[PDB]
């Protein structure tokens, strides 16, 4: 079967889950206890030597790294449920556009969004003090990336074209967390970005992981 | 026709250049003067809103982000020069293996290798003092990534399998640099990694960018 070895609150794990719900696939979430340092010990290390979640299995195929996993799903199960690739998934040029988008959330958006969620959400649970200077700084970085999405979105319905793809999907887990933080202003204040966010988070697959 | 908008000393630009030499493609490297802040103003900003090199053009098609450019090359010019995809490039599973590897070098290797080259190489040109605490630290992170590679390379000739692919190519520029730095001890003291490094560094397309 298809099993995801991960933790339900992690952004990366959620990214896989949504791809799975989008394709309407049956899978099993095998819970890895981050809290007891499970991700840092055998046998988990055997699934991912870099000791991070998620890890994944489709029958005899074993994968780790969430971007790689979602790409595998979009292709292996292409014609099942929602196609997560470009409408013309044969066109290398169209595909190049989406691959830049995936590359961009990875380098520009994600490290920023993750630091911001760590600061305002993870810390909260354990009563740790949020660094106000870090959060103002990271928000400076985010707005910057968001001004880019804003201009892009003034010409295309979604980031990679007129269709929802892996590029948009990849941004859901982190945005869902930031929307319940005062960082939501950066999304709400930019018209085209706000609407884009409304669309991707209102999807039922997106809703299935919160 | 095909042009690279970058800097010949950049690790990300050399990554695109090696792909082209590998495909036996003719191209123009249009020099973007980083030292003059050329990358942070128009019209470069219209080729890459994030203001980073390289950017790329193949006819009407414009791209940025080196990982996305080298995959474009590997596919669009698939049956030409070297095969940078797996021997069986249609195989979804084999491609998954290669993709995980490209992701690992992006997340685990690159930040580390990049910081180590900035400290020991970049700072040197300006007489800035290389911080040795950071070097020691970052080196500790690299050692452990290379330990993973040593295990893998004991199984397969290359990282994604028995063949040289985009997964390997992507590490060349950073390795070329650190080999002229005292970090080369890390590569050389690891037998399989040592052979692997020599294999991929002695390739003509690799040598044409040094
Ligand atoms: C309840 C709040 C949940 C989200 C908290 C973000 S926690 C900090 C955590 N940091 C890391 O895992 C460090 C490794 C880094 N994510 C990498 O990929 O190299 C993270 O980025 N995690 C990202 C993730 O969950 O995938
Ligand atoms: C109650 C809230 C708990 C929130 C936990 C979030 S941590 C998840 C984190 N995973 C990652 O960073 C995975 C990133 C990886 N690049 C991918 O996309 O798969 C991890 O394993 N980090 C461990 C490490 O980096 O060592
Ligand atoms: C003179 C030999 C120098 C070799 C080391 C390059 S210096 C560091 C350089 N850093 C950047 O470009 C900054 C990236 C980005 N601005 C950030 O937020 O970190 C880099 O990694 N650049 C990546 C690249 O070279 O493409
Ligand atoms: C002696 C100088 C020669 C070495 C200069 C290296 S800087 C190159 C750097 N480019 C990148 O980091 C590219 C990263 C991008 N993720 C990619 O892979 O294309 C850049 O433009 N950085 C500018 C920035 O990020 O602000």
Token digits of residue A60: 């005899």
Contact A161, A97 (CB under 8 A): yes
Beta-sheet pairing, A2-6 with B28-31: unpaired
Radius of gyration from C-alpha coordinates of chain A: 17
Spatial contact of A201 and A179, defined as CB atoms under 8 Å apart? yes
Contact, A158 vs A167, CB < 8 A?
Answer: yes
Nearest to B103 among A68, A76, A104 (CB): A68
**8 A C-beta contact, residue A20 and residue A208:** no
Sequence-separated (6 or more) residues with CB below 8 Å from residue B11: B113, B114, B117, B173, B174, B177
Pairwise CB contact (< 8 Å): B96 & A148 = no
Residue A209 tokens read as 């992981």
Place of tokens 């959400």: A121
| Residue (of B137, B107, B106, B132) closest to B120 by Cα position | B132
A83 bridge partner residues = none
Determine which helix (DSSP H) or strand (DSSP E) holds A56, and give its type and residue range: strand A55-58
- Find all residues with CB under 8 Å of B20, minimum gap 6, and list them: B2, B4, B27, B73
Cα(B108)–Cα(A49) distance, rounded to whole angstroms?
11
CA distances from A181 to A113, A118, A178, A186 (A): 11, 11, 5, 11
Report the structure determination method.
Answer: X-ray
Helix, strand, coil % in chain A, rounded to nearest 5: 60, 10, 35
Residues of A in contact with B103 (CB under 8 A): 65, 67-68
Strands (E), B41-180: 55-58, 61-64
CA distance linking residue B193 with residue B154, whole number of Å: 9
Binding site membership of A for glutathione: which residues?
10-11, 39-40, 52-53, 65-66
Atom of ligand 4 nearest to the CA of B114: 12
User: CA–CA separation, B154 vs B169, rounded Å?
Assistant: 19
Residues comprising chain A, all counted: 210
Q: What sign results for the dihedral spanned by CA atoms B10, B12, B17, B22?
A: positive
Q: How far apart are CA A116 and CA A137, in angstroms?
A: 9
B10: Cβ below 6 Å to ligand 4?
yes
The DSSP letter of residue A6 is E
Q: What is the number of the ligand closest to the CA of B32?
A: 4
**Taking CB atoms and an 8 Å limit, are B68 and A108 in contact across chains?**
no
Does ligand 1 have an atom closer than 6 angstroms to the CB of A118?
yes
- The 3-state secondary structure of A154-186 reads CCCCCCCCCCCCHHHHCCHHHHHHHCCCHHHHH
For residue A85, the chain B residues in CB contact (below 8 A) are none
Residues B85-96: b if buried by 16+ CB within 10 A, e if exposed: bbeebeeebbbb
Tokens of A49: 């030597």
For residue B110, what is the nearest residue in chain A, using CA coordinates?
A: A107
**B-chain residues within 8 Å CB-CB of A64?**
100
Distance of alpha carbon B117 from alpha carbon B176, whole angstroms: 10
Q: Do A108 and A167 touch, CB atoms closer than 8 A?
A: no
What structural domains does chain A harbor? 1-85 (3.40.30.10), 86-210 (1.20.1050.10)
For ligand 2, is residue A121 a contact (CB within 6 Å)? no
Closest Cα to residue B99, out of B13, B16, B165? B165
Q: What one-character-per-residue DSSP string does A12-41 give?
A: HHHHHHHHHHHTT---EEEE--GGGTGGGS
- Which residue in the set B71, B96, B108 is minimally distant from A50, CB to CB? B108
| B160-171 exposure pattern, b = at least 16 Cβ within 10 A, e = fewer | bbebbbbbbbbb
CB contact under 8 A, A151 and B68: no
Name chain A contacts of B53, Cβ cutoff 8 Å.
none
- Does residue B11 line the site of ligand 3, with CB under 6 A? yes
**Residue B99's closest CA among A19, A64, A167?**
A64
Q: Which residues of A are part of a known binding site?
A: 10-11, 39-40, 52-53, 65-66
Mutate: best of B68, B80, B107, partner A, most A CBs <10 A = B68
> A5 with A58: CB under 8 angstroms?
no
Cα gap B142→B104, rounded to integer Å: 12
Q: Using CA atoms, how far apart are residues B90 and B25, in angstroms rounded to an integer?
A: 23
Q: Which residues contact residue B54 at a Cβ distance below 8 angstroms, ignoring those fewer than 6 apart? A: B4, B5, B6, B10, B12, B13, B16, B64, B66, B69
What are the two backbone dihedrals, phi and then psi, of residue A96, each rounded to the nearest 5 degrees?
A: -65, -40
Nearest CA in chain A to B57: A93
End-to-end CA distance of chain A: 24
Residue B166 near residue B86 (C-beta atoms within 8 A): no
Q: Do A93 and B67 touch (CB under 8 A)?
A: no
Instruction: Specify whether the CB–CB gap between B13 and B54 falls below 8 A.
Output: yes
Token pair 């053009």: residue: B57
From residue B88, alpha-carbon distances to A31, B51, B94, B165 in Å are 34, 36, 8, 11
Helix or strand (DSSP H, E) at A63? strand A61-64
What Rg do the C-alpha atoms of chain B give, in angstroms?
17
């Amino acid at each position: 079967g298809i099993k995801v070895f991960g933790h339900p609150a992690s952004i990366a794990t959620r990214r896989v889950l949504i791809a799975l719900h989008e394709k309407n696939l049956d899978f099993e979430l095998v819970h890895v206890e981050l809290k007891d340092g499970e991700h840092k010990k055998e046998p988990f290390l055997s699934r991912n030597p870099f000791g991070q979640v998620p890890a994944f299995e489709d029958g005899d195929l074993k994968l780790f790294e969430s971007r790689a996993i979602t790409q595998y799903i979009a292709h292996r199960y292409e014609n099942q449920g929602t196609n997560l690739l470009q409408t013309d998934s044969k066109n290398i040029s169209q595909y190049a556009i989406m691959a830049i988008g995936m590359q961009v959330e990875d380098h520009q958006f994600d490290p920023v969004a993750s630091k911001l969620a760590f600061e305002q959400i993870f810390k909260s649970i354990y009563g740790l003090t949020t660094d106000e200077a870090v959060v103002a700084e990271e928000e400076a970085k985010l707005a910057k990336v968001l001004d880019v999405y804003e201009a892009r979105l003034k010409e295309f319905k979604y980031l990679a074209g007129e269709t929802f793809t892996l590029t948009d999907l990849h941004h859901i887990p982190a945005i869902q967390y930031l929307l319940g933080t005062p960082t939501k202003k950066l999304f709400t204040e930019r018209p085209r970005v706000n609407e884009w966010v409304a669309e991707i988070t209102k999807r039922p697959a997106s809703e299935k992981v919160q």
